């Protein structure tokens, strides 16, 4: 993107909750373009959360994703010798991208055999504040504000 500022491509709202954020999460779950199998997994998870929590599924998802969004991160940059991890805010666009991505990544690290079970338990663990997805977020934040001795390199 040397010329255009690049415009975010809005996606079709959810075919259930109608939430656009929901579709996004489904795309991350999707691999080899098997959208059906993808959605068939996410919704299968919403069912697994309704019996585990008396609260509706969308309430959980929203919470989870939010807990997993990093406020700050470091981005390498040569300044005059070696490389320097410079801390700096994360734009809302990126916080979302990362949360969802990490969610799906930690999700497929869990031992549970059924995919849907992995996403479900992982979303729940996320809203609860636990779970490896929230760890990455914590570790990334712990990463910056741990290099504040370079935060004056905004970039």
């Amino acid at each position: 993107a040397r010329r255009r500022r690049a415009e975010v491509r809005q996606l079709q709202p959810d075919l259930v909750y109608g939430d656009v954020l929901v579709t996004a999460f489904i795309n991350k779950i999707m691999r080899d373009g098997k959208k059906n199998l993808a959605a068939r997994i996410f919704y299968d998870a919403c069912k697994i959360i309704q019996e585990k929590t008396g609260q509706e599924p969308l309430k959980v998802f929203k919470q989870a994703v939010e807990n997993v969004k990093p406020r700050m991160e470091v981005r390498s940059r040569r300044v005059g010798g070696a490389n320097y991890q410079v801390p700096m805010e994360v734009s809302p666009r990126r916080q979302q991208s990362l949360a969802l991505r990490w969610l799906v990544q930690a999700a497929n690290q869990r031992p549970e055999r059924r995919a849907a079970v992995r996403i479900a338990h992982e979303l729940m663990d996320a809203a609860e504040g636990k779970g490896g997805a929230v760890k990455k977020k914590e570790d990334v934040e712990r990463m910056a504000e741990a290099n504040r001795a370079y935060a004056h390199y905004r970039w």
């Binding site: 504040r148 001795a149 370079y150 935060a151 004056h152």
Partner: protein, 119 residues
């Protein structure tokens, strides 16, 4: 243990470190801190954060003598010279005033080759 209330904060800024010295109303130091006193060993000492820490450290060690207000005095140009000032303005320690007193020669000693370059 002498309850001084008010005194002086000296910020010695340079491109390698920032050292802060809190003194009593007439020059004598009470407590001091620096980029090294706070763990930064290498060149992190020159960084502005080290300055901010060094200042905060200096102020806290001062409150221990019931220090409320202080007159700041900066010497040097290095980084963190400004964070050091701001740090003291956020350290509960009332910054009574700020004065720059960097020593400058009226052309005396021949500087090191490093500080001569194109004169």
């Amino acid at each position: 243990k002498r309850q001084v209330a008010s005194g002086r904060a000296y910020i010695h800024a340079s491109y390698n470190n920032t050292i802060v010295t809190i003194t009593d109303p007439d020059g004598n130091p009470i407590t001091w801190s620096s980029g090294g006193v706070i763990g930064y060993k290498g060149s992190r000492k020159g960084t502005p954060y080290a300055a901010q820490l060094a200042a905060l450290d200096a102020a806290k060690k001062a409150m221990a003598y019931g220090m409320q207000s202080v007159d700041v005095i900066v010497r040097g140009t290095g980084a963190g010279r400004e964070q050091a000032i701001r740090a003291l303005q956020a350290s509960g320690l009332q910054v009574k005033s700020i004065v720059d007193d960097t020593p400058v020669p009226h052309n005396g000693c021949r500087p090191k080759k490093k500080f001569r370059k194109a004169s």
